[model samples]
Every structure is written in C-alpha cells, then in structure tokens.
Target chain A: RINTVRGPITISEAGFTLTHEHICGSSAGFLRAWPEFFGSRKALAEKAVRGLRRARAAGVRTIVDVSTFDIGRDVSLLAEVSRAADVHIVAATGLWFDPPLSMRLRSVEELTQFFLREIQYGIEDTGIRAGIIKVATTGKATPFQELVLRAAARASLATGVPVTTHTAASQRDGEQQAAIFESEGLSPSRVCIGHSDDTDDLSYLTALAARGYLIGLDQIPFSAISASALLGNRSWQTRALLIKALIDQGYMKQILVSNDWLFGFSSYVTNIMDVMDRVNPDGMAFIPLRVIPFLREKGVPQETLAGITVTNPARFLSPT
Target chain B: DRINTVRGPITISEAGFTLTHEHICGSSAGFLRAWPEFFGSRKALAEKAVRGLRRARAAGVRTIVDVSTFDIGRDVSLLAEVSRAADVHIVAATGLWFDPPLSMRLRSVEELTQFFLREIQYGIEDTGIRAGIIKVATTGKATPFQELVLRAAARASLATGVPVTTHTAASQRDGEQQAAIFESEGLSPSRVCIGHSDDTDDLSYLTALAARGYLIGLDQIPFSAIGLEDNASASALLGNRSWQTRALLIKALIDQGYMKQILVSNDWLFGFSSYVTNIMDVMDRVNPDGMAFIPLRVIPFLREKGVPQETLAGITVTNPARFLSPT
Candidate 1:
C-alpha cells in the first residue's frame, strides 16, 4: 500500500509520481495558532493547487512531498491540496534541516517513537499516515542529523513505509544514509536516496545503485535548490545526458525523476509570485515541461521513461 | 615468436588470455628481502599467490605480466614457483616503479639505460628467466628523474626491441604525456601500453591513445573502495561492486572499434607489507577470487552486453600476444 495523504491507496494508484517536492512552508502550528503576514491560508493553498493542477495536466498522478516536521509538513494542507488538484500526495515523516537545540536531549528511541506515530497512527492527530520517511544531511551528518537518520531507519523498519533522503551529492551523504539503514536492517531497495543529481558526478549514485538503493534524481535544474537565475539550454541538455548515461549503465529501475520546486515556502515576508519566480521559475511541471521533452527529443522512448516516472516510484513506496 | 616468462621463454602464441599489468606481491620495498617475517612469512606469501593464480587459471587466465619492479622486492623465484604450480605463464618486468636506490640517483640517462639492459640481456641475477617487458612510470607530472627513467626505458626498449608499458597517473592524463615522450624518443606507439586507463572516465582520452595505435591498459582495477568505514565496529567492503565503471569504460572503447587496443586486469597484490598488518588477510577476505576478477566477473558482464567471444579474446588473448612479441 502507498500511504498517501487522502488515505493509504494501492501502489498501482501512485502513477507518474514526482518523488520529491515541498508544497508549503514551515509555519504550520505557529501560524495555525498565529499567517496572513502577506495573505490568508486560502491564498497559499490556491498557489500550490495552481502548480499541482498544471502538473496533473501534463500527466503527473502522484507526488511524494518530502518536507518534514521542522520544515512545517502540514498534513491537513497536503490532504486538502491533494484532493483539490486531484493528485495522489505521499506525505513524509522524519527530519529536514538541522535539528533544533532541544532535540539533542531526546534519545533515538524517543525520536523513533515520534516518527513511528506519524507513519502508523497519524501526523499529530490529523490522522494522515505518512507514506515515506524523509531525512537530510548536508555533506556528512552533524550529530543531530545522524540521530534523525537512525530514527528514520528504525521507524521505517517498524512500519513498511519506505525512506527517501536529501543528500549533499558531492560529499556522498547518500552512502552514509544507506549505511545507517543497513545497520537498522532496512532493505536497501526500500530506501530512496534523494537529491542524487546535486553533483554532476555519477559515482555517488552509481555506488548507491549497486548497493540496491533507489536513486532519486529528484532535483533536475542545473542551478540547484536555491537560485533565481535561469540556465541555458546547453546546461539543461547536459543534465538529460547525465540521465541517459545512467540509463545506459543499466540503472533504469532504481532511477526516479522529480523537480524539487517549492510551491509556497515562506509563511511571511516576500511577495508570492516573487518567491515563486526566485526559487521555482518552472513550477512543479518543470520535469514534464522541460526534462521529458528534451529527453524525448534526445531519443528517450516513453516506454522506458515510464519506468523512471511511474513504475519505480510505485515500486519504491510499496512493501514486499 | 618467443615471449619471456618466469619459467624461461615461451612462444608468443603460448601467452593466452593474459592480465597485462598486475603484481603477484606488490609490497613495500626491502620487506621481502630484509624482513620476510615483517608482515607474513615469505612461504606464506608464495602460497597465497599460488592459490590466487590457480583460481585465475580456473577462470581461463593463462598468463600474468607481473609489473612488480626489482627495487620493490619482486621475488621472481616465487613467481617461477607460482607459475609452475598454477600452470600459468608469469612474465617478469625490468624497470623502476619506485624511485631508484641511492646509488642510481646520480646516474645519467645512459647509466639508467645500462641497468635495464643488464636485466633484460644478461638475465636478472642467476634466475634462468629473462625480463619480458620494460616498465616505466610517470606521476601527475613527469618528474625530472621519472623523465630520466622514461628516456632510459626508450633507449633500452629500442636497443633490445622489447615492448614498453607505463604506470600513468589517471587524474592527470599522464598516458598522453608518456606517449609523447616515447614518440619523441623515436619509439612506435603500438609498442607502448598506456597503463591504468580504468582510473578515469574520459573516453576521449582512452580512444585518443587507441587512435594512435597504443595498447590501452584498462588494467589496474582496484579491488574496491578500500579503507576503514567511518563506523568503528563494522568494517565493510563493496568488493567487486566498483568494477562497473571500468566495465563501462571497456565497453565504450570497444563500441568505438578499439577492442584490439584494450587489456584488462585486477592489478591485485597477494600481500603488502606496510606500516601495520600485511594486506594478505585483509584483501583476501574481501577479494577471494583475487586475479580471477576479470574473467569470473567482468567477462560475464561483457558477454551479457553482447560482447562477442572473439572481442573478449582480442582484448585478453590476441592483444597480449601481439603486444608482447618483439618486432
């Protein structure tokens, strides 16, 4: 089963999925009690749905939103938006960013229990069972990030939900995540090592793929996660070549593609369109609009491309 | 038609399916001679090499070109014993891999040339076996002395008409530079094997050498990413998982019609006497097949990719015979 925000759906229902995206910001509880710093929650929800509907129009059927608690993973918002845009949204449990200072006092058991609650029961009484575990490390894990990585592995073992990660591609954070998961007895196939495309070097992903992990080629833009500048077609074409090269090396099954565009990241401060243009000029449909088109132009058959988009994501999220 | 082997000389045709660049024992200098028990017993090192070669022979490897330099304590007697017991042809190299001894430091290029000439012409020490190939190496940049070794290798190689292979730093594309110096010294490129092209992914550089008719050594594939993993309790190895890149490199070159120019080997060492533990136990634990890595793992992979038997033979068999025979 793929535990999506609307409910746990059959794995087959997770079609044409983008394996990583952040739809909203990190102001859930603080702002649920307190946002309209720029606009109402309705306006923020509308902007996310606009991008999601555009993605759906281009044949995207599911999205694994990997934003977690520290990143303000609002399950209620995800469920509403999933229904509004008519897309299957798999929400995540675990950590993103460095942990707060207070999280240092908590043991691995406490953090595991916390993440387990979200996977099994719900995310803080919203009753929305998270379908995937999302973890992050910059280059190597700081002390707290390692704690969160171990906890995510434990939570994933307790429940059958698969794990995905935000990895600093250059420093090989994906290998570290896989190692910890291996220690926790988690199957490598059930883990998605995300942001693998951050570095142009394929060695990191190559090793991870050989070790039987799902390679999340989730970030496609040459500019990386935070940039306002638009890249040339040449740079974009090179990224597709990297993807095609990976396919040629026989890793199509372990490959998953997505654009990690943030729909509405900040709760306050900046203007909405300005915020959208600066970080995500292409919107959520970037992969469908930019990547697949060029990939097809370069002789990538859709039959093989489907394995990257639809089948692998479905296969990655389901239990044995 | 004859090629030199540790046992004596064999016809070039007898050298079949060879690993063009490897070591039976590539330990630190002086250990095998001055301190055999410093790491493991000399007898133990010989047995380890014999067992590894027997398995390689089982996988259809008929010969190994041991590039272990004389200065590095290459025990040719051990190579001879391993050759007979395993029924494998073992070719010995005569040249400098490490910097030469203090006595050779002040020696001129002609003097260096004489040293290599002595080993090849008169035979190395009292052993019945003569040197098979002249090996020389250059680092990221050619050192002044490494250049001295390069010129000496050219002089000796031209005089005796022996094939030359070089140890090149991969990241720096040292193969091209080595080839340049060899060409300038008036030696043919086909007689030189550019070693360790497996360490880089640049097909342009590899094919560029093959374009010049230089034999490309996609040899020297390390066992894997070997080092202590960050965690203390669990020492892990990815083993042969690292072979894919080298496999792809080989496939890519052949796809461009350079199969005749390619050669494959594990560049494995039976033992290494270093700062601490001898590598015999550590390496064998992970890479038990040792020298059989290419045939046991790589050949199957190439065949799976539809690399024909003739193409495989061209790289491992025909190429070595053609490259090793003196003009």
Candidate 2:
C-alpha cells in the first residue's frame, strides 16, 4: 500500500485510484507560509507514510501529485517519497498563479517550454515518473492566470496528460480557466478547478459542472458557510440551518474533501490538533474522521458522497 | 510551616517576606521564539535562574512563584536545584499564557479545562515539586482564546484547590476584562490576582478591580521612570511625600480597603538579552535604594496620608503570602 501525489495507491486486485491530495512538494502558502519554522523532509516523509497508510486502509491504488514546478514544487522529493512509500505516484508540470513581483517570468513562451519538457519527461532527467498535467491561476481571471491557463492547455495537448487547475472564489475563474484551455484545443473535462467551495453560489458550481469541468471544493471545512459558522455558532439550530443550505444547493457532485493536511510547518501543529476538534465537537474521532462524514449525516446521499469522495477523484485521475 | 490559603502548600515559616508576583525563570516572548533556544540548551537559562534566586535571597525575599508556564522553560529539576541553592521557597506555577497561538490546539474548552486540571494535579500532587498557585493571563480585551485559557485556570483551581493568578493588560480595560471573565467562569474574585494593572492611567478602574478582591500589580515601575521622557511626570505618579503628587496610585489603592490587593515587582526577565545581555543587568540597576522608589517613595507618602505600616506590609509581604498560601 502506498500514497502518491494523486492520493492513494495499492497493489492487489483493487483498481488503483486517487483524484486529489498533495504529494511530496507543495505551494508558496504551503511551502513558505511560515519560513521561521520550516518543516524538514523527515517530517514530510512521516506524514507521507501516514497518508499512505490511511489510503491503503481505504483501498486506494494510485495518486497523481499535481504540484506544478513553477510554484516551488519539489518533484524530486515527490519522486523520492513515491519510491519509498511503494506507491505508483505521478507528478504534474505547469505554471502557478502569477509569480509575485520578485518571481515574475519574462515571457509565456519561456514558461510554456519549461512546462512542455516536464510534462513530456520527468523533471531534470531524474526519471522517477510523470503522470499528469497541472496548472493554476489567481482567482480573479487576471491576465497572469490567463497566461498560466494557456500554458497548461498547451502542455496538456503536447503531452496527452489530463489538465487540472486552481480556480478562484468567484467560479468566474473556473469559467475563464476552462475557456482558456478550450481555446488552446484542450477539453474542459480534464480540469479540476480546485477550491470550488470558496463560493456557495450553486449556479457558479453548476455552470462549471455543465461544461464537463470537475469543480473542486476542497476548502469545505474552513469556510464561513461551513465549520467556522459551526464552531462560532452557539446554537445547534443555526448550524443545522447552514448545513441545510449547502445541501439544497445540489452541487455536491463537483466536490472533494480533504484536511488540506499540511504537516511540515508551525501551522501543522495547530491544524493537526484542531482538525478533528473542528469536525467533531463531541470528541468522537471515528464519527468525525474528516469533514465528509459530517456532511453525509446532513442529508447528502450515498452515491453523491461516493461521487465527491470516490468517483469524482477517479475521473480526475483516469488515464483518458 | 506557613500554609498558603489559596493552594494549601506549606511555605517556609520565615517566608514572611516580599513576594510581589515573582518569576525565578520564564520567557515573556512567545514559544515561537523561546522553544528552539530552550530545546537546544539549558546552561544559559539555569545560570540566569541561579542569579535571579540569589538576588531574591540577598534582598531578604523568601517566597516567589515563577508563573511562566505553557512551554516557557518550566524545568522542575533546575528550579528545585536553584531553590535549594538560593535558600528561597521558590513556589512554582502551572498554567497557560494569554496568547491564542500558544494553547490553540487543546481539543476544545473542555479539553483545555482538563489539561489545566491535570497540570495542577500532576505538578503539585504526584511530582515532588509543589505548585503554590495557578497562573493564566488575558489581553486587554478577552479574546475567545483568552477566555478559554482563563476558564481552564479557573476549573483547575476548583479541582486542585489552588488560587489563580492572571497576567493582564497594562490598561484598566485589562483589569475590567479579567474580573468579568473570572466572574463569568464562576471563580471567586478572592482567588485571583490581576497582574500589570499599573500600566493603565485610570485610577478608578484599578480601585474597582481591587474592591472586587482582585490583587492589583504595580510591577514594572522602573520601566515607567526609565522609559518615559518626562521623569518628573513619572515621579509625580510614584506618590512622593513633599509634592503630594498623584503618581502614588499604588499607595492610594493601599489607603483604600484594598491594601491587601496591592503588590509590586520588577517583572524582570533575567535570562533574556533585554536585561542579561546588558553589562550591569537588572540587579545592579534595581538595588534596594532604587527599589525604595517602588515602596518607600510611595509607601512613605501613603503613611503620611493616614495609611499604616500594616497596610504597607500587606502590599510587600503579608498579602502576597496570604494570596499564595491557602490556609
């Protein structure tokens, strides 16, 4: 049993599948959020083992770690973890949100060339593996995010790997991310607009789903509409109202859930400690393993649960 | 042996000496800074604590509680060793700090309550070392995190039979918030000490806090004269006899029935570069003659203004011993 960037991997008759999860490397906020307390590779490896064990228990098979290199993504470390964990891990290559002032690239062509090489071959001739195409943009559909969308689309077309993207809060970013990919002759079905949960406006989610894009609402627990209100609200009745509103929206299909579990930083201490408490105020770890079970009890159906938890991830990772 | 009425700990019989919220060893900066250094080594800190305990003993002090908890270098073995070396009854404290980031991970309010309860019990009951009091702190405005920490401290007091001490804001709002939070948590006003009340300019607020049975701290007076630009203006606040100045709020609180609530100290950090890194350090800078600015300069004025030596004793010795001792 193993866990890779795509999520979980296993050997056996069970089909290998995982749609979303971080692999070995990560983002600016994930990587350098608190530089004073940087996490060591040892800690990351320990977490990767835990992730693998969890996934194997759930019978998962393979994972695609979709961290693009331009965002300080460490594919080499991902490759290392994949080997050590005995997981079939796949890495992605593409652009991240517009690099801030210090890190801005000179031209989109230069960025596209880098993405093409990584997608075509594993990074820097290490030859661990390349399994998927990943790209992301800032939430506002800005010119910078548009450039990333274009580069990701081109890289996917050139390498035959499905493309995924980080979408913004407005769902407008997902529309534009999808539009940019389509304009470059890539299909919309390949892109998982990460963080679809930023907006509870169902029309925005449904619009992306209608276009065959996999809308991802990974920040399900941290939002104002979700756990924040649940924790802040003194009355269980108020919590019930907020949960029902989410259920009525009917866009759970285009959803995914994760702890967004970052283990290699100061935030890791707080997040790991607080994650379970946020999900379960009553001290039952099994009952509130993650945010998913809570949502399940609140009237979201089993197949829809399977879709958000299992089937949707499969669609993102399928070798189409 | 003298029994501390609040926590029921036995104190040295001759410990009827000054103890105005002392810290033998503790860091003021959050764990975000100190954890690495303490985790790395103890030689520097152990030396600092030794110096601090020796200074207190030389000054004729007998009992002092090091109120630093929540991973702020609370080494029992080193503290006990220093206490033995210094011949001072170093009553240790067990509690959390004011900041949310420090104890934010405790499962919930209930888990935090349980943690403090266990901390008090284990640090005092099972361990050879004895904790004379429970300490927790709050910012000027009580954030949910601060309130939760206070709640835990209060519950610990209820369970383990220890009085609570609070590190409050310098402003009057801090005292107000401390009283409100402790009262709401069902802790008696008698069981708590409101630390750092001297930072505020509002005399009425301090008076009210004292009236409510919360000890008022006039610690850190050296900073006022040394740091403020107008030393005369600061002196006036120090309660001089000749000028009949208003600076002696500490004395004024004593003149009121709240004499037992008044306490003073340097709130000094002996280990940090802020004090120790300097050539002379706080001990050289704050000798008995200079320390008189705290009690003599102020307490003398209060005596002339109809306050008694017993009242002054309450602030310097009697009150602190009673507050820390349960019976």
Candidate 3:
C-alpha cells in the first residue's frame, strides 16, 4: 500500500498516473487573505476537483503532487481536494529553490527526522501523510541543495518510499542529485528524475535511464522540444518524437510522463491561469487527451503508452 | 425570552434574516480611545457604517451579529446608533481578538469571566448597551493564554445563557479545538457557531462539528484583495472564483442533512487592520453586496447548484433563531 492525502491506498488503486504535477503553489496560508481574488482555497479546490475529474474521465487515476514545502505545500488543502476530487493524490514533503536560514539551518538528521514524522505520522499534525520525499535541483550543488537532497534520500532509505525529483535538466543537474542520493545509499532505480523533457540531449537522458533511473518526460505543453527555442515554440512534435526515440533505444520501462500544471498558481501579476491558458491550457487533461493521442499517432503502441503512463509509475511508487 | 439588539431587546423571531457574524465598523482598539479628539473623523466613520447598514436594510438584512470585540474596537454606542439610523437589529459582542492587556493577562480565568459577565449583565463600559453574545478567538493552535480566554467566554455564556461564537483561523481546523474547549467547559455545543468554518472545505471536520451540535458559520466571503499589500501581490489581484465554491460546500452540507446546522454571512468590516480614511474606497474595491453578500452572491450560486429555498431558509433563518435561543 502507498499513502495518499486522504489516507493509504493499495498499489492496484494507483492506476494510470501523472508522475509529476502540482495542484497549487503559494507562500502557504496566504490564500486566506483573498481566497476569491487568489481564487480562494474553495475556488482552488473546485478547480482541482474539476481538473482531476477530467483526468479520471480520461482514464488517469492517481496523481503525484510534487508541490514541495518551500513552494507552498498545504497538506490539509491537498486532503480536501483529494477527498472532493475522488482521486488519489500522493503529497510531497521537502524544500524547493533558495530557502531562508530558518529552514536551511537544520541539521541533516533533524531534517530527516522531521520528514520521517511526516511519513510515519502526518504533515503538520494533520492525519494526511506525506507520500513522497520531493526535492529539487534548485542549484548546482549548494550546501542547502545537498542538505535537503541528502536528508530526503536518507529518509527514503529509512522508509523504503521513493524520492521524486525536479532537475535543472538543461544543466544536467539530475546527475548531481542522483550522485548525492546514491552517496547516501539511495539506489538510482528508486528515483524518478523529473523535467527530463526540459532538455533535448538524449545522451544525458539515456545515461540516467541506462543507470536504472526512471526519466520523466513530465513537462507537458512546455517541454521546450528544442531547448534553444522560446516557450511559445514548444510543440507536441519534438517531445513525442523524443519519447519515441527513448522507447526505440529500449528504455521504455524507465519512462514516466506528465504535464507539470497547477490549479492554483500564484504570480506577481494576475492569476496564473491567464498566462497558463495562453500556453499548455488543457492542464491535467493534456497528457491523456493530447500528448498520449499524439504519441499513438506517431506509432507509439497502446501497450507502451500504458507502460509509460500506468505500469512504470506504479512500480516507482511501490516500496523498495 | 428575547435577544438583545444594539437598539433594545426583541423576541428572537424579530431578528429576521440575520448575518450571524460581521462588523459594521472598527478601528485599532485604542485608536479612538487614546485620542478623543478624533471624534470628528470617527463620526465620519460612523456615517459610513450607517449608510452601509442602511444598504443592508434595503437588501432584506434585519439583524446583524456585530462581532467587533474589545480588541478590535467594539463600540456599543456606535452599534446602537447604527441600528437606530439604519433600522436594523444589531447584536454587539464582548470578547478579545488580541491576547489581553498586560494587567488582564495576570488575572485568573474566573476574573476574566467576571469581566465578561459585567458587560453581558449590565453594559459595555459607560454606554449602558449590553452585549448580546460572547466571542473568543484562537490561532491554529491555542496558546495557554487563548485557552484562558475561551474558558472565560464559555463561563460567561453559562452565566448569562447567551450564545457563543468564535473567531477561528479556519485553515488550522481551529473550530474542532475550540469545540473541544467549549464542550469541556460543560457548555452545550448548540450555543456556539464555529466562525469562518467555510475557509477549509473539509466535509469531515464540518460533519464532526455539526454532528456534535455546533452551528457552522459559513461567513468570510469574497475576501478583499486588500490591494497592493505585502501579503497580496503588488498587483490589484481579485477574481479567482474560490469563495463561490462555498455553494458546493453548503449544498453538500444540505444534502448530508446538515441544513439546520448551518448559518451564512459575509464577515465584512471597515478599518480592520487600521482606520480607513475613506470607507467608500474599501467598499468600492471589494464585493459590492455589502452585508447582503449572501443574499446576492451566495443565494444565487446555491440556486444554480440546486440548493432549494427551503434549505437556505433553514440555514439563514431557522437555524440562527434556534442557535441564539436561550440555551
């Protein structure tokens, strides 16, 4: 069984999955000030439920919420959305980007113990447990980055749960993250290196996959098919071909795919939906409705699509 | 048996279509206190409240449970004045939003309960306008000081048999913790309506509280953008569609047979963090329905969601009367 925001669920219940996605991102508890203007927590919940309902209708069942703690991971909000949306959501507990000394000053053991309590007990004292240990390659091996990466991996070592990650794929930062994890006794197979689609370098992608790491073609609609192009220039053509090439190279079992979208994305300007709608607007619906159909049209078989979308994520999420 | 409005006492049935929790006007607790000289500007604030309350009167709101506590400038005289001018019933509250004064904090819980009783039994300060309800507050986790305040509020309700309401940080599920304290004090849960209960849409939390006999206040609607503040972005951010989702929450509660355990309102106030130099500026920027936000924004949304009028009456009219009825 794997943990979800609502509670624990059997691995069989974790069907057709989005290996990486976000339902929300903010400074946490900031939405209460203008829940309506920020589209309130209630609005965000409905937005999440509507999107999850569509994903379910598209045959996508479980969704891994990779919203890191520093990036405004509200476990209570996640549980509310999960219960309302009627979908299984695996929540993450870790940090993202550059955080303050308040969180950064903790010892690795201190951080590991904090994460263990989250998994064994619950998040912030809520009964909803953190299902995954998520960290990001927010930098090129800064002390804080390595600190969280190591703590996250050590927690994974103790719990047998997997560590899903974000990478600066263009910088090939997954190598640095995996190196830190393996140094702490976390195996590469127990990791899913996300945003692999952010780069066009098949060599870097394959090397990681060949080393037993599951590569995430997870940046749907903004995969930047050609890394040198603008966000507007991203298309289904290049990334679909990239997935096809990965399969052709016999790395099919080591691939996990999703669109990294959120229902409640905060910005310095207006609501994020305005900008997101202009690009990658289909959101959770994009993977099964658009991306998968595009891949099938490109001669990727129904069976391989199932393996990428369903079988591989289930295996990666299962306890070691 | 009757309830106390700011104007005078009236039978519970006279308090028609009441907004259970709101504030007509307020300033920082001592903003007006320290400077009696600002009476001119304060009177300007009072006029804004009268106009706003009159607008509410036009919209069919007959009574408002004005929950402006001592820490947030609960002015019973202004409350009384507003009720008379706007032609509405106003129930004032006596409680604390800030922890306590340095001296008051040293006092025992029983001492605090006596302080609350004096106001509930007689009047607020020298105004001779008795508060109609008891209000108390706590953050996500209650500090020992807040626990003392809750006990005092609970004990005062027992003394006066007046209803109790709460100011909770709903994101913390503070409602349940407050409920436990109230129950432990031997206060019936029926005497309290968990305020800001809609902020977290957890059906189970709401279910647990309502099932245990607490009236849930689905207040705090269309939260102001509080435009260009440090908390809200530098932009004038406003439309996100989150508050409207309360319709779904309310509809679900109704479907689960909880229609009678719910009450609805928009917890609007002026000079919340500080005094507003111009009240219309705040009104112009937020939801325009004023205190009528539920009748305007929520009722229509509930209708679209298929929550019938009968259920709404149960939530808005029937339950509230029963909620504040002598306990």
Best by lDDT: 1
Per-prediction DockQ, in order?
A: 0.00, 0.03, 0.01
lDDT of 3 by residue, A28-132 (tens): 322432244444566788888898888888888899998765555777777887888788999887767633223454568767876786777666546777778
Candidate 1 lDDT over A33-119, as tens digits, reads: 113422567887888898899999988999889877656577788888999999989888887763332233356876787688778
Per-residue lDDT of B267-306 in model 3, one digit per residue for the tens? 7764343332333355446667677777877888888878
Q: Which has the better DockQ: candidate 2, or candidate 3?
A: 2
Assess candidate 1 and give its TM-score to the true structure. Answer: 0.49
* Candidate 2 lDDT tens digits, B115-192: 565555544323445566777776657767667777777777777657787776655377677677778878888778
Total clashing pairs for each candidate: 0, 23, 4
On TM-score, the leading prediction is 3
Q: Residue B100 of model 1: what lDDT? A: 48
lDDT per residue as tens, model 1, B1-327:
988899887997888889998888765333354234434567777787888899999999999999877544567777898899889999998887644433343457876787688778877655656788998887798878888888899888899888998887766999988988888899988889998778788888889899999999888564454454552322332232366777878889989999889878887878764212424566666567788988988888889997898888888888999889977
TM-score of chain A of 2: 0.70
Better of 2 and 3 by TM-score: 3
| Chain A TM-score across all models, in listed order | 0.91, 0.70, 0.93
Candidate 1: residue A217 Cα off by (Å): 72
Give candidate 2's chain B TM-score: 0.76
